[PDB]
Amino acid sequence: QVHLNQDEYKYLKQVEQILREGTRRDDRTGTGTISIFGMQSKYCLRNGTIPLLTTKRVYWKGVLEELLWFISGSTDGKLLMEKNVKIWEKNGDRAFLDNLGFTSREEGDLGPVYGFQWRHFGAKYVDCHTDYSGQGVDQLAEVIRQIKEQPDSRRIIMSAWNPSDLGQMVLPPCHTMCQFYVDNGELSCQLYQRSGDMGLGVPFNLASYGLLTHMIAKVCGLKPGTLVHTLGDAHVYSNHVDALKIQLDREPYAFPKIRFTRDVASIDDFTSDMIALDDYKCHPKIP
Amino acid sequence: QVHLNQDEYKYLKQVEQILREGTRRDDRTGTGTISIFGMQSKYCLRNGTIPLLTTKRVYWKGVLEELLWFISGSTDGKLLMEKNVKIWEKNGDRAFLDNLGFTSREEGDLGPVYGFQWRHFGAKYVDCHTDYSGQGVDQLAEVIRQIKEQPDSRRIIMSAWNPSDLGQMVLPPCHTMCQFYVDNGELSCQLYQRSGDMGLGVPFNLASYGLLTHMIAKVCGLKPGTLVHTLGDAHVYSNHVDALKIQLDREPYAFPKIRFTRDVASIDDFTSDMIALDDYKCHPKIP
Numbered sequence: 001q002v003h004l005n006q007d008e009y010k011y012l013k014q015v016e017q018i019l020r021e022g023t024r025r026d027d028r029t030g031t032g033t034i035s036i037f038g039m040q041s042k043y044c045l046r047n048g049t050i051p052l053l054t055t056k057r058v059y060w061k062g063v064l065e066e067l068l069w070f071i072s073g074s075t076d077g078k079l080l081m082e083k084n085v086k087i088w089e090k091n092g093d094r095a096f097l098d099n100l101g102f103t104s105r106e107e108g109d110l111g112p113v114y115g116f117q118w119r120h121f122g123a124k125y126v127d128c129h130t131d132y133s134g135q136g137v138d139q140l141a142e143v144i145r146q147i148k149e150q151p152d153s154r155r156i157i158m159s160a161w162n163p164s165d166l167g168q169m170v171l172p173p174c175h176t177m178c179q180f181y182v183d184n185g186e187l188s189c190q191l192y193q194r195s196g197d198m199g200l201g202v203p204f205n206l207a208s209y210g211l212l213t214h215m216i217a218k219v220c221g222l223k224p225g226t227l228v229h230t231l232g233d234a235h236v237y238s239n240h241v242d243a244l245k246i247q248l249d250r251e252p253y254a255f256p257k258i259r260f261t262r263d264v265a266s267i268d269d270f271t272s273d274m275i276a277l278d279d280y281k282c283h284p285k286i287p
Numbered sequence: 288q289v290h291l292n293q294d295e296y297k298y299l300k301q302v303e304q305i306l307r308e309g310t311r312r313d314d315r316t317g318t319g320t321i322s323i324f325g326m327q328s329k330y331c332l333r334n335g336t337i338p339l340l341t342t343k344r345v346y347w348k349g350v351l352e353e354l355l356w357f358i359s360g361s362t363d364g365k366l367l368m369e370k371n372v373k374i375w376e377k378n379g380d381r382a383f384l385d386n387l388g389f390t391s392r393e394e395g396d397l398g399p400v401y402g403f404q405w406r407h408f409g410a411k412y413v414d415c416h417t418d419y420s421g422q423g424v425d426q427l428a429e430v431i432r433q434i435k436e437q438p439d440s441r442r443i444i445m446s447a448w449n450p451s452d453l454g455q456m457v458l459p460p461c462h463t464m465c466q467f468y469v470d471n472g473e474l475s476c477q478l479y480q481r482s483g484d485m486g487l488g489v490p491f492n493l494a495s496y497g498l499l500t501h502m503i504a505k506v507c508g509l510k511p512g513t514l515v516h517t518l519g520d521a522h523v524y525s526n527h528v529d530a531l532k533i534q535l536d537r538e539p540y541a542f543p544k545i546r547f548t549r550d551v552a553s554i555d556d557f558t559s560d561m562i563a564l565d566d567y568k569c570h571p572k573i574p
């Protein structure tokens with residue numbers, strides 16, 4: 001049969017394939033996972049659609065506020081908490097920092113993570129309160145320039161994987177790079193994700209890069225195309241198979257759609273008040 | 288509809304899918320291409336198999352000598368010419384260098400390309416005859432230590448994409464990063480290739496990373512697993528559609544197998560005389 005939302009059904013079949021074919025391993029601390037290495041899915045973004053899963057609600061406020069935080073170049077977790085978004089709190093507090101040997105680091109200074117690499121790749125990091133203007137490569141600005149002036153390019157790439165800075169990161173990048181692609185006035189985006197928790201993190205990442213593509217599409221005067229999601233270690237955690245069993249038996253509703261309620265002078269000119277999400281209907285929460 | 292070599296048949300269907308579903312575009316070199324954005328295939332390396340295409344012969348000597356050249360960390364194209372491997376020759380001679388503004392550069396100094404990034408990521412490049420010992424990150428050594436001591440890691444990654452150094456590269460990286468993966472003593476490798484010419488370059492890259500996986504597996508005392516080949520712009524050139532129509536109608540022979548005829552102290556201890564390729568049978572050349 002045809003499903004109202006085929007793209008999310010395929011995601012459920014991804015989860016289903018992992019449980020059926022994946023290999024059972026104990027990640028390092030004992031905690032087991034079910035894992036397939038090498039997967040790929042595509043999600044249609046046309047007509048403002050954004051792939052926020054309907055069988056299990058996604059922390060939309062987190063996606064939005066975190067992505068703007070990435071774009072701003074910030075590595076200060078405290079700015080995200082001032083928006084009431086706690087995803088980076090445990091990774092930036094005293095205990096977690098000291099455990100990595102960052103005993104001199106202010107609480108919340110996550111190190112040279114995503115935002116720093118996107119906008120200042122190759123720059124000398126010191127802390128999250130340093131003015132890095134004009135230091136390093138502005139990958140996000142270069143991408144936008146390539147899309148506008150060289151739409152046919154096959155090198156429109158933005159990487160967060162900086163071997164020199166990995167040591168000083170509280171967490172190594174998970175979505176390690178993405179590639180953009182223009183075809184018949186439509187902007188597409190492929191994301192390579194080295195590691196993916198299909199129960200929690202992966203749906204969140206789909207929304208982030210789906211939203212990012214919609215933003216870049218508007219800045220470049222293009223229409224949204226397709227999101228290609230490539231996974232390295234696509235895995236489910238053993239202790240959480242019950243929740244996915246429930247999620248899989250649910251028929252997906254239609255994806256919501258993004259709507260930008262004002263114009264923007266650049267990728268840096270977005271604000272939470274003008275990113276609208278319409279008709280996000282989900283199935284009830286899962287214990 | 289079974290096949291002696293299923294993995295190569297799927298490749299033929301990849302090319303076929305590109306031709307039937309791909310989008311027709313004119314790239315920055317003129318001359319059109321047929322392209323799909325986002326593809327993925329898997330090739331079995333178990334029991335020493337290496338995916339060297341049989342429907343169209345691959346330049347095995349180029350694969351072998353170039354990969355050893357990469358591993359050595361060399362950026363001097365002249366060493367490859369001393370082995371009779373003339374890829375990278377036109378990219379490193381006077382005309383091409385001056386066209387990019389490297390008017391002060393010695394012939395053959397390809398810049399901070401693959402070899403430099405693999406073994407000295409983040410280091411200050413100057414020329415291809417400089418001792419970079421202790422400079423930058425030795426990603427290839429980091430990967431090997433991770434495989435040995437942390438086989439379950441989801442962060443075993445080696446990237447050739449350095450935004451800081453792109454300007455000084457004669458050619459921007461095409462195979463941009465790879466991720467490794469250990470499961471029950473089997474070593475796998477996923478390659479993300481931003482751009483892929485299915486008629487020439489892609490078959491070569493599959494063998495390169497296939498051989499690389501076989502090599503790293505032996506150093507770490509593991510068995511070869513799976514090669515996951517992810518493509519960004521997977522394309523055929525409109526000029527060569529006639530040739531591929533023939534190639535697609537060919538039944539693949541069995542893949543050849545790699546056999547290492549002596550022990551190795553490290554990934555740096557390999558030589559052409561001890562990498563053997565057994566039973567590589569190909570279909571005849573195509574006009």
Ligand SMILES: Cc1nc(=O)c2cc(CN(C)c3ccc(C(=O)N[C@@H](CCC(=O)O)C(=O)O)s3)ccc2[nH]1
Pocket residue numbers: 057058059062085086087197199200201202204
């Ligand atoms: C094992 C593991 N799986 C993950 O998916 C994961 C994700 C992150 C960061 N990340 C990419 C996240 C995205 C969304 C998140 C989250 O906590 N969502 C909750 C709401 C939390 C809140 O309201 O503050 C949820 O939707 O249930 S966490 C960090 C460690 C992880 N660890």
Ligand SMILES: Cc1nc(=O)c2cc(CN(C)c3ccc(C(=O)N[C@@H](CCC(=O)O)C(=O)O)s3)ccc2[nH]1
Pocket residue numbers: 346349373374484486487488489491
């Ligand atoms: C349009 C284009 N397609 C490619 O595949 C390509 C590949 C490279 C570099 N590369 C990744 C290569 C892999 C194999 C090669 C090659 O030329 N092989 C010869 C073998 C004959 C010989 O050199 O003796 C061949 O079969 O044409 S070249 C550079 C520019 C390109 N440009």
Ligand SMILES: O=c1ccn([C@H]2C[C@H](O)[C@@H](COP(=O)(O)O)O2)c(=O)[nH]1
Pocket residue numbers: 172174175195196197198200201202205441442
């Ligand atoms: O953006 C993210 C960050 C983390 N994770 C999940 C995947 C993992 O299993 C875990 C990260 O652990 P490591 O891969 O770093 O070991 O969190 C995601 O899915 N998306």
Ligand SMILES: O=c1ccn([C@H]2C[C@H](O)[C@@H](COP(=O)(O)O)O2)c(=O)[nH]1
Pocket residue numbers: 153154155461462482483484485487488489492
């Ligand atoms: O390792 C390589 C190097 C090059 N190419 C081919 C693919 C292309 O179409 C062309 C690269 O040109 P650009 O990606 O720079 O546009 O060469 C490969 O397939 N593999």
